[PDB]
Design a protein around this ligand. Sequence first.
Ligand SMILES: [Ca+2]
Ligand SMILES: [Ca+2]
Ligand SMILES: [Ca+2]
Ligand SMILES: [Ca+2]
Ligand SMILES: [Ca+2]
Ligand SMILES: [Ca+2]
Ligand SMILES: [Ca+2]
Ligand SMILES: [Ca+2]
Ligand SMILES: [Cl-]
Length: 356
Amino acid sequence: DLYPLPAPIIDVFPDDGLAKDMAKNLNKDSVNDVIDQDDLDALTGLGFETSTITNDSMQLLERAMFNNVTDVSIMEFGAKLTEFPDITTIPHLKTLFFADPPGRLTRNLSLPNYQNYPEMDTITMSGNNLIGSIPDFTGMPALKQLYMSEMLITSDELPNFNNIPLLITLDLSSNQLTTIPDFQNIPNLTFLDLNANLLTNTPDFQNLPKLTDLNLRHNNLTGTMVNYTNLPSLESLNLDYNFLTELPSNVLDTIYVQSQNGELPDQTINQGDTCTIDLPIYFQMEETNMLVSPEVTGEYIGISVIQLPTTVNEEGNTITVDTSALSPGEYKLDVSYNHNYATGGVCSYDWNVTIN
Ligand SMILES: [Ca+2]
Ligand SMILES: [Ca+2]
Ligand SMILES: [Ca+2]
Ligand SMILES: [Ca+2]
Ligand SMILES: [Ca+2]
Ligand SMILES: [Ca+2]
Ligand SMILES: [Ca+2]
Ligand SMILES: [Ca+2]
Ligand SMILES: [Cl-]
């Protein structure tokens, strides 16, 4: 497929948009300018920005040998470019980058099981809707970083990667994952970003001995979660904006939580009774100095919100809301703590009470 050189750029790359971008990469003023192999050899990166390039025209890159190119960056692209091709003329490619275009999920991209880029180190496709699944890569043994945030990835599209043993960073934030694999073969993984997914738990990871940062902010973790037994390198576990009533005790010293919500059990009491709750997370946060303010408040929510006297029982680790003056009926109660009026943060727990 290699076009004979020397030749005009437009003859080597017979597509208006591709030729324009190649002239810019080659620092030639015109697509009519004649290039030779030395001009190609001077390139160490290729940038693309003309949105008329399509899958078919990008394939024309196989007509030229790029002996020294290690980076491909696609900064702007149209709807007819949905894949960077697996061509044989960029043998030393190390980084592949697609920009996150303006707007939300406006472009679609597929991720081939690339075979001709054995030196690939980093792939970034964040912000683009993934077409199909992420392949269980077989041709990129040196892959170290994978940025795949905001791509509408579901758990059926994410394999338990078998052949990328050097992976260090995996960013899957802002997707629709309901489960995450108990990753078997990425033991060098140090950073796992899962914020803004739909997770309800994770496995008690069996082989992540080097993981230092695990971000689970804004998921659906509810009540209790797995109490990790084998994350010896863990430094930060972000559980902010979940629905836990208790934090995992084995890793409590790594946790970031300032806001949290939750539901406590229904109770039935008699008119004149107070109402006492368990709230393990409050006591954990209090005792490990995670609170920014000390007050614990209670209220009931009807036509208006009415505050109730609320006391913390530190010996028995319970909280009592004084419901003794309420008449019989059905009530929605709330206990809140860690109020941060400056930031909008709060930890707030709701439950229903029947008073007979
Ligand atoms: Ca000229
Ligand atoms: Ca532009
Ligand atoms: Ca070289
Ligand atoms: Ca975007
Ligand atoms: Ca999908
Ligand atoms: Ca395996
Ligand atoms: Ca106590
Ligand atoms: Ca509430
Ligand atoms: Cl030549």
